[PDB]
């Protein structure tokens, strides 16, 4: 029975995502000199300005001014007529720095409470939901084509929003595609509409899914000329859903950018993606969602629950059992089970933290061992 579901994405250079990227760019830069640095760096971008403010506990010395402008230039906001320019804009900092000064490290208790949810579903090749997958690929392509000379009238900022019609649990096809891209004065809308059809939408949306019925809305308002942080206002942690699973799965509140991995808000969440993906790469279920939660100063999580929503090939009991044998979910264990203390984090900050395979939380190494330990098939 049919039903339909939607998910959005934005590009690098939508103002919130500018903030996520600059945040994670500081965290990377600090982690490069000091992997054990504890960092929380939040950022606010508005037409003139980038305020990067945080607390950081490190020996590292880094230049927040140049880190900022280099991230703004890579996105490509480089001239006033764009909205915002990486070379003349103001960058202010309010980052306060501290220098660091149980018997088994893994048993160190969790620094801040909370809840994290992870998901995987066999709906795609990457085990992510198809919506959020396609939304990302659309915005991603957009930047590819901007960035690679094909369609050099494109400017950085853009949103995509795919809406899928299922019938139960099978993707049936694509009811609507929204895609709105910022562009120059060169081009008018009919002309933009052929290009975004040819070069962005057509090569990404799978064809059997596209129909005579697919409502497509390329630049519905027309004329998007400006432009990122001019007249809008971006801050880290705002694209929480796009960062995860486009709202196919749940979420406890937490943002990721600018959090170094001691922060469970990030790690528990990466790890939950990792547990659920391995669970389904092993055929124990088809869709799995895990909630983990932690309490301040306790190190074993206060809760684990699994929802395989009717898709099991072993009982939930056996499954919750397996979750605990194969995965060290103590805060410091996460960091080890996934080897986090590395500058891997900027590339996360646009296009989605999950479904992208080459990050340590997307690897399915535990798949087999996991099949075995209750009910090898």
List 343's β-bridge partners, or say none.
none
318 labelled ligand-binding: no
| β strands within 230-322, DSSP E | 234-235, 287-294, 303-308
Q: In the set 54, 114, 261, 355, which binds Mg ion (CB under 5 A)?
A: 114
The secondary element (H helix, E strand) that includes residue 316 is: helix 316-326
Q: Does 176 bind K ion (CB under 5 A)?
A: no
**Strands 170-183 and 215-218, how do they pair?**
parallel
Tell me the window of 20-28, 124-132, 257-265, 286-294 that interacts with Mg ion (CB under 5 A): 257-265
Please tell me the distance from the alpha carbon of residue 119 to that of residue 306, in angstroms, as a whole number. 10
Q: Does 369 bind a second copy (CB under 8 A)?
A: no
Tell me the window of 109-117, 142-150, 162-170, 329-337 that interacts with Mg ion (CB under 5 A): 109-117
42 labelled ligand-binding: yes
Please tell me the distance from the alpha carbon of residue 326 to that of residue 338, in angstroms, as a whole number. 12
Q: With respect to a second copy, which residue has the nearer C-beta, 105 or 222?
A: 222
Footprint of a second copy on residues 286-305 (CB under 8 A)?
291, 293, 295-298, 302-303, 305
Smallest distance, K ion to C-beta of residue 40, A: 5
Q: With respect to a second copy, which residue has the nearer C-beta, 247 or 375?
A: 247
Q: What is the dihedral of CA 135, 137, 139, 140, to 10 degrees?
A: 150
Q: Does 240 bind K ion (CB under 5 A)?
A: yes
Q: Does 117 bind a second copy (CB under 8 A)?
A: yes
Please tell me the distance from the alpha carbon of residue 31 to that of residue 25, in angstroms, as a whole number. 10
Please tell me the distance from the alpha carbon of residue 120 to that of residue 124, in angstroms, as a whole number. 9
Tell me the window of 79-87, 223-231, 250-258, 294-302 that interacts with K ion (CB under 5 A): 250-258
One-character DSSP codes across 173-194: EEEEEEEEEEE-TT--HHHHHH
Q: Does 112 bind Mg ion (CB under 5 A)?
A: yes
Tokens of 73: 């230039």
Q: Does 42 bind K ion (CB under 5 A)?
A: yes
Q: With respect to a second copy, which residue has the nearer C-beta, 135 or 151?
A: 135
CA distance from start to end of the chain = 31
One-character DSSP codes across 63-112: -HHHHHHHHHHHHT-EEGGGTEETTTSEEEEEEEEE-----SGGGPPBSS
Please tell me the distance from the alpha carbon of residue 359 to that of residue 126, in angstroms, as a whole number. 12
Q: Does 94 bind a second copy (CB under 8 A)?
A: yes
- HSE-CB at 198 with a 13 A cutoff on CA atoms is 8
Footprint of a second copy on residues 20-49 (CB under 8 A)?
40, 42, 44, 46-49
Tokens of 240: 């929480």
Footprint of a second copy on residues 328-367 (CB under 8 A)?
none
Footprint of a second copy on residues 164-193 (CB under 8 A)?
175-176, 178, 180
Smallest distance, a second copy to C-beta of residue 339, A: 27
Binding residues for K(+): 42
Interface contacts to K ion, rule CB under 5 A: 42, 237, 240, 258
Residues that bind a second copy (CB under 8 A): 1, 3-8, 40, 42, 44, 46-49, 51, 53-55, 94, 96, 113-115, 117, 159, 161, 163, 175-176, 178, 180, 215, 217, 220-221, 231-233, 235-242, 246-253, 255, 291, 293, 295-298, 302-303, 305, 316-317
Q: Which residues are annotated as a binding site?
A: 14, 16, 42, 55, 98, 157-159, 223-224, 232, 238-239, 255, 259, 263
């Amino acid at each position: 029975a049919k039903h339909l579901f939607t998910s959005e994405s934005v590009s690098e250079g939508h103002p919130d995502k500018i903030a996520d990227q600059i945040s994670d760019a500081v965290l990377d830069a600090i982690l490069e000199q000091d992997p054990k640095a504890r960092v929380a760096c939040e950022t606010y971008v508005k037409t003139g300005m980038v305020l990067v403010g945080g607390e950081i506990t490190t020996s590292a010395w880094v230049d927040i001014e140049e880190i900022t402008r280099n991230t703004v230039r890579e996105i490509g906001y480089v001239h006033s007529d764009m909205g915002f320019d990486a070379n003349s804009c103001a960058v202010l900092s309010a980052i306060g720095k501290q220098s660091p000064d149980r018997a088994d490290p893994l048993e160190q208790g969790a620094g801040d409470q909370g809840l994290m949810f992870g998901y995987a579903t066999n709906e795609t090749d990457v085990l992510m939901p198809a919506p959020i997958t396609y939304a990302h690929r659309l915005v991603q392509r957009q930047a590819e084509v901007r960035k690679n000379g094909t369609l050099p009238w494109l400017r950085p900022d853009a949103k995509s929003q795919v809406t899928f019609q299922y019938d139960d649990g099978k993707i049936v096809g694509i009811d609507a595609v929204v895609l709105s891209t910022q562009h120059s004065e060169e081009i008018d809308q009919k002309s933009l509409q052929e290009a975004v059809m040819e070069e962005i939408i057509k090569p990404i949306l799978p064809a059997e899914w596209l129909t005579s019925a697919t409502k497509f809305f390329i630049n519905p308002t027309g004329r998007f000329v400006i432009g990122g942080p001019m007249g809008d206002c971006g801050l880290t942690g705002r694209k929480i859903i796009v960062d995860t699973y486009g709202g196919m799965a749940r979420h406890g509140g937490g943002a990721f950018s600018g959090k170094d991995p001691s922060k469970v808000d990030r790690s528990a969440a990466y790890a939950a993606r990792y547990v659920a993906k391995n669970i389904v790469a092993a055929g124990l279920a088809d869709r799995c969602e895990i909630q983990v939660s932690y309490a301040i100063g306790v190190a074993e999580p206060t809760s684990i629950m699994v929802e395989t929503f009717g898709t099991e090939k072993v009982p939930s009991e056996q499954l919750t059992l397996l979750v605990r044998e194969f995965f060290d979910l103590r805060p410091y264990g996460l960091i080890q089970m996934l080897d986090l203390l590395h500058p891997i984090y900027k590339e996360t900050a646009a296009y989605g933290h999950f479904g992208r395979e080459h990050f340590p939380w997307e690897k399915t190494d535990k798949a087999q061992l996991l099949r075995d330990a209750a009910g090898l098939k």
